[PDB]
Symmetry: C3
Subunit: 257 residues, 3 copies
């Protein structure tokens, strides 16, 4: 398909599938533009309360297509302003994102997978940082996410030595939250995304903003931002519903506003 991102809506969930299975969903500028466009649509679509990202075929993504750039003096500083708006869009997404890692995620493919709020892997899936084997540094936010997700000791080993991690090893480190058999991965991930699509979408979005900023703030700054964002969550119809549901001891019926 032109752009190489498949798009499907179900029950409040936009399902995005990386679709270059013949090249293990290797990333090109074209694929990144299509993914940006799809994330923008998902976020704008008032019928969408959650996103699910997965790969077509054997792989999640092998990362940058190492054929896309033809022997010329590479300008990665320039190009990464492109990987960069996609990462900006993922990081700031105002709806929850499930990632279903169906196979290998390497390099920027591993970066993209780790931007999921909740991450599931198939048995048989694998992670490898990859960049150092091409003489490159981690990019697409991997140098930001990895030490936060697995701690600095594991981030050093994973990045410097680029070992291949099994899905069970990934589970141990916090790279994923759940490992499921390959034939059940999309059912389980879609089940979780539909759960989140009934959730308090505004609370999810603002909680994600606090988590993104937490490490660079002083405690004083963190308490100030908590105050500001709790002010905004406090004004939502969902907060009022949440309080009613607790007082009546029934499930909340959230609307995402």
């Amino acid at each position: 398909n032109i752009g190489m991102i498949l798009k499907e809506r179900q029950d409040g969930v936009l399902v995005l599938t990386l679709n270059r299975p013949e090249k293990l969903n290797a990333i090109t500028g074209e694929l990144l533009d299509a993914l940006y466009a799809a994330l923008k649509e998902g976020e704008e679509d008032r019928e969408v309360r959650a996103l699910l990202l997965t790969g077509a075929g054997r792989a999640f993504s092998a990362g940058q297509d190492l054929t896309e750039f033809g022997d010329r003096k590479p300008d990665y500083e320039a190009h990464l302003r492109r990987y960069n708006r996609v990462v900006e869009a993922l990081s700031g997404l105002e709806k929850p994102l499930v990632v279903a890692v169906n196979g290998v995620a390497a390099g920027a493919g591993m970066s993209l997978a780790l931007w999921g709020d909740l991450r599931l892997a198939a048995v048989g899936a694998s992670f490898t940082t990859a960049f150092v084997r091409i003489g490159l540094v981690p990019d697409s936010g991997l140098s930001f996410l990895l030490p936060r997700l697995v701690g600095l000791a594991k981030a050093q080993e994973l990045l410097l030595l680029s070992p291949r991690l099994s899905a069970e090893e990934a589970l141990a480190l916090g790279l994923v939250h759940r490992v499921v058999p390959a034939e059940k991965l999309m059912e389980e991930a879609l089940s979780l995304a539909k759960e989140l699509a009934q959730g308090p979408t505004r609370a999810y979005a603002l909680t994600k903003k606090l988590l993104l900023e937490t490490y660079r703030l002083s405690l004083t700054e963190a308490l100030a931002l908590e105050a500001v964002l709790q002010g905004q969550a406090g004004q939502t119809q969902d907060h009022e519903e949440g309080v009613r549901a607790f007082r009546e001891k029934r499930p909340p019926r959230f609307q995402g506003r």
Copy 2:
């Protein structure tokens, strides 16, 4: 008791007990003012070298009293400047704090428990972030503490899905340092707090300041603050005692100055 914070001194330890057992020690502005007052007294009392915080009855704390605010347009930005001076006081406390989590700690109750320097839980105690089920974001410093304590991967799952964690699960993640039978919790926690109340109180206070600031500093800034605070610890009578005790291979007798 008026203010709902019980206060007792033993052997250098101020014991603070959240005391609204009939509402699972649910937090009100009144309780927060009483806790602030008690922390201020503990810190000012030269007979106190350590604090121990626990709950009365079944619960540690169920967090914000979801009856305190009566159907009016809530102003959480305003109110949190109140949760906020209490968190400021906890974070900056110039004496070590043990927390004994005797039962459920939910929402701001979980926030308060996690401000302990050393944290023990009873078998049967439990943690739940709770905020997202009311359509709110984590507050009272939970968005600051949780990713630092358990890493970002576990913080995402705990905050977005609000699962109930057993004391043994909490131990695994680093939410607590020790799990003990319910009938031994106060004996063990008081034993540890009395140990710290013989400790180098100034070294504890300055070590806590370094830990609070560590993530937002450059290595250059971190080394500069280490230099400044080690300068201050170096001038204490306790440092001179610590050096004598090491040279003579005997226990130090610290005074907290």
Copy 3:
């Protein structure tokens, strides 16, 4: 030996050995000047692509020599500008550093060991923060490294209570990456350092810069620095070699430029 740092080159590796075995490699200003000088030489020597740091005798290092300062009013703020250029040099080293922890690492000895990019310990080796037992705060970058390496929950316990950790406990926490029998430690560590000395030295150096800065940056700042440093790695002969080797499915032959 004058300066108490032994220096030996093998197969692209500068081997540095802390050499005051009679005082468990206890740190003095003189030892720190010698270590700074040795790190500077290793980094300047175009025949060196990796460093390995270890201890002579029983210990890795017992940390500051608690005989060096003679009963005078200590000025640790002044002196730490000395521990500080050594830590600055370690942190910014533009070649990978393996640490082989052959025995106890306490206080600043533990600080120094944890500056390794990859860390191995002998069975029988041990770690202890130590500072709090002398009434001091963690220094030599320990307040920076420890919470990043083991998370805040373990850093609090390790620093406030100064327990002695076995090599297997250290492995569990991420203080080291590998534990090996004492008689195999230098063979394994030298084997790993020779591996890294064939590696893409520029990618290692720039990856280390991203990891050092990651926690204090916004995601926007982190993506900007990734762009800048990937630009520089992209211009290296090693990047061009890495791409050729992947396209031909053969091992890269990196030069470190």
